[PDB]
Design a protein around this ligand. Sequence first.
Ligand SMILES: O=c1ccn([C@@H]2O[C@H](COP(=O)(O)OP(=O)(O)O)[C@@H](O)[C@H]2O)c(=O)[nH]1
Ligand SMILES: O=c1ccn([C@@H]2O[C@H](COP(=O)(O)OP(=O)(O)O)[C@@H](O)[C@H]2O)c(=O)[nH]1
Ligand SMILES: [Cl-]
Ligand SMILES: [Cl-]
Ligand SMILES: [Mg+2]
Ligand SMILES: [Mg+2]
Ligand SMILES: [Mg+2]
Ligand SMILES: [Mg+2]
Ligand SMILES: [Mg+2]
Ligand SMILES: [Mg+2]
Lengths: 289, 288
Amino acid sequence: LTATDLARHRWLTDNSWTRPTWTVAELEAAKAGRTISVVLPALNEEETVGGVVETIRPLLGGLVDELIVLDSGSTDDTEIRAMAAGARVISREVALPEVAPQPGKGEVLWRSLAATTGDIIVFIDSDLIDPDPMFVPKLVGPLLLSEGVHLVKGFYRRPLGRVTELVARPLLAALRPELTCVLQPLGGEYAGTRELLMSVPFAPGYGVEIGLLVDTYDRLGLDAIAQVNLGVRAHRNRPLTDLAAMSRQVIATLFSRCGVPDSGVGSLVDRPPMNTLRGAALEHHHHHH
Amino acid sequence: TDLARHRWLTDNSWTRPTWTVAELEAAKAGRTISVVLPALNEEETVGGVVETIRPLLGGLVDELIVLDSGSTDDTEIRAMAAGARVISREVALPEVAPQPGKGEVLWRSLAATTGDIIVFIDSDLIDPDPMFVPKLVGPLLLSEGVHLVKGFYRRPGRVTELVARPLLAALRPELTCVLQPLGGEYAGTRELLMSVPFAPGYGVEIGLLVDTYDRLGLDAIAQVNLGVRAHRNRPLTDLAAMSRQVIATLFSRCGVPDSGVGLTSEVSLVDRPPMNTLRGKLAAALEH
Ligand SMILES: O=c1ccn([C@@H]2O[C@H](COP(=O)(O)OP(=O)(O)O)[C@@H](O)[C@H]2O)c(=O)[nH]1
Ligand SMILES: O=c1ccn([C@@H]2O[C@H](COP(=O)(O)OP(=O)(O)O)[C@@H](O)[C@H]2O)c(=O)[nH]1
Ligand SMILES: [Cl-]
Ligand SMILES: [Cl-]
Ligand SMILES: [Mg+2]
Ligand SMILES: [Mg+2]
Ligand SMILES: [Mg+2]
Ligand SMILES: [Mg+2]
Ligand SMILES: [Mg+2]
Ligand SMILES: [Mg+2]
């Protein structure tokens, strides 16, 4: 047993839930004045965005205080379908007028920090085929009930992806081995506190998830990170060209957080902490005494 | 930088090698060629691979060796029947205790061979073609300044496209021109191979590629198409362990601190030293 194994074992005991079965009523009662914003990033998801919004809508006015689709420049019917399904639709330009947009998912999530007011922000992908209504309660459970948790990663069980298992987890094993305890570090369903999310830079495009995970870990360690089982979902097939581009950006973002230079050979920049434009900051763990 | 890749492809990459065996034999000019097949429990395929190379023995090829990596099946007996000399890891380098992995096997073969050119061919190949060795040694014999030839297959793998090529893009960007940097069929000069450390296990190919690039340059590397072959579907658990070691070896060659922590997998950051440090007199005898 290695030091990584030992930490993983205890981290799973304290910070991982295979059955995150908190009730909505219990979570509402735990808010204690805190508010919850749910953000769906969306670029051309007309076939699925309404279905995702529809699974979250029953929580509006209770557990969830706002439900926003942050549109990324869609040209299909994404925006109007999200409206009819009951979401608030905000463009990248309206979310943060003073900064010109650049492409990619990371830009959308970063801008959503300026468009939301919740003390807890939940991100859910708008391309999900089978969203489940309990996603949001499961993701916010540890933030509302567990001392010291600032980031919650939702993972799926598989029926009994390649970038995660060949790129992200092996690179974390090399560079930040304690983080190999996180089952799906690239997953798009996760939640965080405003205090954390406003204080960290946002990586562009496909790098935003891994960047947030390492930035959280480097400031607060394993104690601040939790994970919850959202249910059983089969892997979807993505073209190898897409996976290679995702891998290249995961590498670039991991390298930038871990002190490894990157050629830039494949143009998008990291965005600074939103508290430089709209933001009490997050207290890091002390490295001195 | 696309121009750099473009220039290299036109001079150092062959999609359709024209060379005949007779042409290559005439060009040897006193150089000798050793062919080494690493083998660990390959009883079903090692004979078929050896049989495709044996007709060259005594002509283009001066020795044909299967370096047995501790097999417990009929690998050794079937390799001898097909015409190869079988050499164990212990015999190849007796005073150094063996450690597991393919890199160990290829490194040790340097002490058991005499060729000015050494050709490595995997013993698990299902459809070996008799022109593999001729195509691999073509650029070494007929071009100037080439020291490492990488055999690639035209496709009709996930670790190459998701791990090796993107990491090279990040850390050795010129090397993304190499189509299949992890491929197990390749040839090198004695001068190169005797003088570089060998990475362990699954890292040996990428280690040799990067060390060759740094020490001798892009123009010392070539690649040749060995034919159309389909990707063999390996279990993702095997691919993950392979990826982890490719990462450790590239990090070792870049000075990135690698934890040495495996996947919950065997990973090593410890190279073997250049063989000319342990076999200095053999190495000097083979110079010039
Ligand atoms: O520039 C972008 C790219 C993606 N997305 C959204 O982010 C989620 C994850 O995107 P994905 O990684 O699937 O993008 P892909 O690889 O399909 O382009 C989906 O809900 C997309 O609609 C977005 O809002 N803006
Ligand atoms: O410790 C080892 C591992 C592999 N091999 C040989 O090296 C080649 C490439 O091995 P491969 O990567 O297929 O190994 P695997 O993934 O099957 O363990 C094959 O001819 C194996 O027999 C070897 O001699 N020793
Ligand atoms: Cl993935
Ligand atoms: Cl591969
Ligand atoms: Mg999409
Ligand atoms: Mg528009
Ligand atoms: Mg998706
Ligand atoms: Mg703490
Ligand atoms: Mg084998
Ligand atoms: Mg093989």
